[PDB]
């Protein structure tokens, strides 16, 4: 399979992947329309518009082709949908438990207009980087440190606010590295400044989990034209530490939502020729799956009476419509305080996270 699916093709390929699994598993919908009216196709995969939200299943999204000429993400997301469906039909136990315990959202192309304006063989050493209105989708989200001109960004924002995404990663091009959030800094210096989060180590762990499984990223050296041998230790990096980006989407995802997002630069050739795409799939498949599995780390549970805020780390998260909460954490002891307005709180301390599956706890307020 080596073909760049364009408009229409996208929907056809996504629905072919949906039919490539059991019925009732996949739902392909649109979170909005681009400037030219191209739908923003999103495929939802889970056992059982977007349909009802299943209990005990964290929401995971992977928004690719967010820059128009960074299109390895688009094809690897399409192949990820196809592989998930094929594994679910074939009885792939790993993918079976993944789909049973995770509500995976895949967004192959956030900027279809820019993808259409992209030209084959352009490695990016404009080429459709912006939407058809000329605005960058990565420089349009509200910076923590006009929506009408970016309908794709507004649609993504509404989709995020309508859900309770736990783990996510947007996939990019032009390098091979996993950059974790706070993509900018208050000083807004070009490079060099380290901008850590309250969950800096958790984001480091997620970036490590993706990078170590990537054949190129695990080396920590993209070794690509116009890079000055910019060696990223461990294959991971911080946002402002790599280069300044004002209004990045992962920063909004972290600050304005419960989402934990890491930008994944899969390849340094932005629009590789079709022949290489197969290789790109084998370069990313496992890592992608790995990232989804990493949603099952930390603490998970429900808050029930006998939108509750969970506090650990100056980053609080809220519960879902079912009261479920998922806080991504690494092994160790944490002090979880649950606070609901009008419900006098509960500080359950000594919550111990073990490596692998997330720790369970049910709160009665």
């Amino acid at each position: 399979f080596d073909r760049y699916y364009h408009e229409e093709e996208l929907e056809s390929a996504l629905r072919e992947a949906a039919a490539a699994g059991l019925p009732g598993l996949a739902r392909l919908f649109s979170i909005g329309r681009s400037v030219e009216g191209r739908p923003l196709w999103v495929l939802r995969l889970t056992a059982g518009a977007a349909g009802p939200l299943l209990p005990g299943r964290p929401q995971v999204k992977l928004v690719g082709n967010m820059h128009g000429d960074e299109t390895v993400s688009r094809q690897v997301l399409i192949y990820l949908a196809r592989e998930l469906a094929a594994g679910y039909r074939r009885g792939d136990p790993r993918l079976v438990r993944l789909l049973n315990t995770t509500d995976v959202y895949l967004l192959p192309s956030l900027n279809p207009d820019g993808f259409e304006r992209a030209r084959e063989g352009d490695c990016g050493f404009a080429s459709g980087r912006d939407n058809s209105r000329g605005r960058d989708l990565n420089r349009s989200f509200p910076d923590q440190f006009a929506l009408d001109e970016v309908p794709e960004v507004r649609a993504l924002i509404e989709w995020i606010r309508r859900n309770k995404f736990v783990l996510s990663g947007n996939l990019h091009g032009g390098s091979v590295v996993a950059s974790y959030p706070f993509d900018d800094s208050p000083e807004h210096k070009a490079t060099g400044i380290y901008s850590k989060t309250s969950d800096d180590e958790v984001f480091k762990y997620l970036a490590k989990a993706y990078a170590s499984n990537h054949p190129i990223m695990k080396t920590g050296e993209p070794h690509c034209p116009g890079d000055e041998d910019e060696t990223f230790k461990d294959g991971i990096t911080n946002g402002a530490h790599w280069y300044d980006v004002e209004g990045g989407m992962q920063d909004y995802n972290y600050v304005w939502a419960n989402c934990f997002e890491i930008t994944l630069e899969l390849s340094c050739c932005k629009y590789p020729p079709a022949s290489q795409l197969r290789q790109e799939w084998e370069n990313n498949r496992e890592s992608l799956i790995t990232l989804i599995e990493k949603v099952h780390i930390g603490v998970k549970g429900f808050v029930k009476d006998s939108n509750a805020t969970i506090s650990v780390i100056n980053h609080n998260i809220t519960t879902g419509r079912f009261g479920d909460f998922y806080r991504l954490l690494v092994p160790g002891t944490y002090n979880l305080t649950v606070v609901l307005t009008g419900y006098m709180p509960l500080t359950v301390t000594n919550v111990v996270v073990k490596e692998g599956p997330a720790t369970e706890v049910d709160f009665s307020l």
């Binding site: 699916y5 364009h6 408009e7 259409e116 304006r117 992209a118 030209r119």
Partner: protein, 391 residues
């Protein structure tokens, strides 16, 4: 051997010397052709001409080595044929054979250096408008002319055309005529999965209307889309005779005239069918329309003979160039020296304009130069519309 360009005042005299060797007839005669621009202009000279002039036109040529000075022979030039003087002076070219279509014209019936003087011809617009035809108004002052803006609360409402309702303002001119062309993407996957090169081609009854009337290649942010047969497509060096790959050819882009001319792939506009609406795909000449001609290129034809018909409308060649009632006569070591009258630009624009420049970054071989094996190549078709004017 005279081969150089002398720039004197508003004139440029370019001389070039080269070494040389349906029903109709094929004569044994060979004909001399120098109807391509690169036969006279070096890429440096073409850059110098197009970066500093709002127009140019030939004045007179001198050709030294019979000629059909009365044009009694079928004028075969101007059909964009091969056999032209090579762009590279060191190249030795073979004289193309002379043949015509139909009337037997025996060439030795004619009696066998010379100088020809070009008739007064309009300057070629070596500029692209900095204003759009629908944006000639003042973006600060409303119009005193009202337009019907409302029809139901069923009622009748009129509004003054202003900066916000800019598309509703009354206007004095219309875009050029349209003869709609089928749209083809350079991104191949975006096209239909059928061979519609001929079946869906825009043709006149069934000769193909290639390249048709001068219309913009694409609108904004659509450089991948081009009219199916509405643009000039030049051949890259050592391109295939037929069935050439897209990377083996160079497509010209006429979007510089998108500010006055309609897009070649899109309709001219909407009229009233009866409240049904009809879409006009082909639009003839209307009062008040203005349109730019097709751009000339360093590789493109220079002139073409206007057919000796009873009438014509805007007799400018559809391939670009200068429409001449009496073009340079057919000529049945060679030095051709042509003089061009330049139109010097007088622009008060503050910001710098767009000039043609060679890419700074490293290249394996210099563009518009010879490669390792001594083969001269033109890497891209250099346009002529780089400076800017106002409508």
């Amino acid at each position: 051997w005279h081969c150089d360009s002398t720039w004197l005042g508003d004139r440029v005299i370019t001389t070039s010397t080269r070494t040389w060797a349906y029903f109709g007839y094929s004569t044994p005669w060979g004909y001399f052709d120098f109807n391509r621009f690169h036969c006279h202009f070096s890429p440096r000279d073409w850059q110098r001409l197009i970066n500093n002039n709002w127009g140019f036109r030939p004045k007179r040529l001198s050709f030294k080595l019979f000629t059909d000075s009365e044009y009694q022979l079928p004028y075969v030039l101007g059909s964009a044929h091969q056999g032209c003087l090579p762009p590279f002076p060191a190249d030795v070219f073979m004289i193309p054979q002379y043949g015509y279509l139909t009337s037997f014209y025996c060439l030795e019936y004619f009696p066998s250096q010379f100088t020809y003087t070009f008739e007064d011809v309009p300057f070629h617009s070596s500029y692209a408008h900095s204003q759009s035809l629908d944006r000639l108004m003042n973006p600060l002052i409303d119009q005193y002319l009202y337009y019907l803006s409302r029809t139901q609360t069923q009622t009748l409402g009129f509004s003054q055309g202003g900066p916000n309702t800019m598309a509703n303002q009354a206007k004095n001119w219309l875009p050029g005529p349209c003869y709609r062309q089928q749209r083809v993407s350079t991104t191949t996957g975006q096209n239909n999965n059928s061979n519609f090169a001929w079946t869906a081609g825009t043709k006149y009854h069934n000769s193909l209307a290639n390249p048709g009337i001068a219309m913009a290649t694409h609108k904004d942010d659509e450089e991948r889309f081009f009219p199916s047969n509405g643009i000039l497509i030049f051949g890259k060096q050592n391109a295939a005779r037929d069935n050439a790959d897209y990377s083996d050819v160079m497509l010209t882009s006429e979007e510089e005239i998108k500010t006055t001319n309609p897009v070649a792939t899109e309709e001219y506009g909407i009229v009233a069918d009866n409240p049904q609406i009809g879409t006009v795909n082909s639009q003839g000449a209307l009062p008040g329309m203005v349109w730019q001609n097709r751009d000339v290129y360093l590789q493109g034809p220079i002139w073409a003979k206007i057919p000796h018909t009873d009438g014509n409308f805007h007799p400018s060649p559809l391939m670009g160039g200068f429409g001449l009632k009496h073009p340079p006569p057919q000529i049945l070591q060679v030095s051709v020296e042509i003089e061009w009258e330049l139109q010097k630009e007088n622009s008060k624009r503050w910001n710098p304009e767009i000039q043609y420049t060679s890419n700074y970054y490293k290249s394996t071989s210099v563009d518009f130069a010879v490669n390792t094996e001594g083969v001269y190549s033109e890497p891209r078709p250099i346009g002529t519309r780089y400076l800017t004017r106002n409508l």
